[PDB]
């Protein structure tokens, strides 16, 4: 987690092991952490995202 | 059958600060590795094969471990799972390293 606390999570039902990549940003459920949806990696574009013409 | 009710995900991550390795049985005058004059030391003597784990909430708990996870596994600085609800070492997780490092392979 972004606040810093690691959890070992299971496998969602809208996802397969093939869609989950490593380093990939993922939504976890805030009710019980579990990967739900893979979400475009990198939170870093914001000064490389506003220089696309 | 009860082992399979506990094993459910998700669960907290920890590393092992120090394995104490007190002696669970060595006398009934104690119940620790330490031996000292006088019987009845009440529940001060009740520390055996024991894990002080430090969680990824950045706190430290003592507990008397689960012997599922042996203390022949545990060394200082191993990744361990710990059940979140009551801090018990649920399992050992294979040691892994930063996601950026993993990409280099």
Q: Which of B13, B102, B103 sits opposite A6 (nearest CB)?
A: B13
Identify how the structure was determined.
cryo-EM
Decide if B12 and A10 are in contact by the 8 Å CB cutoff. Answer: no
Rounded Cα–Cα distance for residues A2 and B66 (Å): 30
From residue B54, how far is each of A2, B20, B98 by CA, in Å?
A: 18, 14, 19
This PDB structure is determined at a resolution in Å of 4.1
Helix or strand (DSSP H, E) at B99: helix B99-102
Distance of CA A52 to the CA centre of its chain: 24
Distance, CA of B18 to chain centre: 9
* Alpha-carbon dihedral sign for residues B50, B51, B52, B57: negative
Distances (CA, A) of B43 to A36, B3, B9, B33, B88: 46, 28, 33, 14, 20
**Which of A5, A24, A27, A35 is most worth mutating to test chain B (most B CB atoms within 10 A of its CB)?**
A5
Contact B10 A33 (CB under 8 A): yes
């Amino acid at each position: 987690l972004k606040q810093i606390a690691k959890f070992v999570v299971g496998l969602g039902e809208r996802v397969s092991p093939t869609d989950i990549e490593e380093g990939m940003r993922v939504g976890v459920d805030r009710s019980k952490y579990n990967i739900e949806l893979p979400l475009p990696p990198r939170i870093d574009p914001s000064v490389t995202m506003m220089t696309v013409e | 059958e009860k082992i399979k009710n506990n094993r459910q995900l998700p669960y907290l991550v920890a590393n092992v600060v120090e394995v104490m390795d007190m002696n669970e049985i060595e006398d009934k005058e104690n119940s620790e590795s330490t031996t000292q004059g006088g019987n009845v030391n009440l529940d001060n003597t009740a520390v055996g094969k024991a894990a002080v784990v430090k969680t990824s909430s950045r706190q430290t708990v003592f507990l008397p471990m689960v012997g599922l996870v042996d203390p022949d596994k545990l060394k200082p600085n191993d990744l361990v799972g710990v059940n979140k609800d009551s801090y018990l070492i649920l399992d050992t997780l294979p040691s892994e390293f930063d996601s950026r490092v993993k990409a280099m392979e």
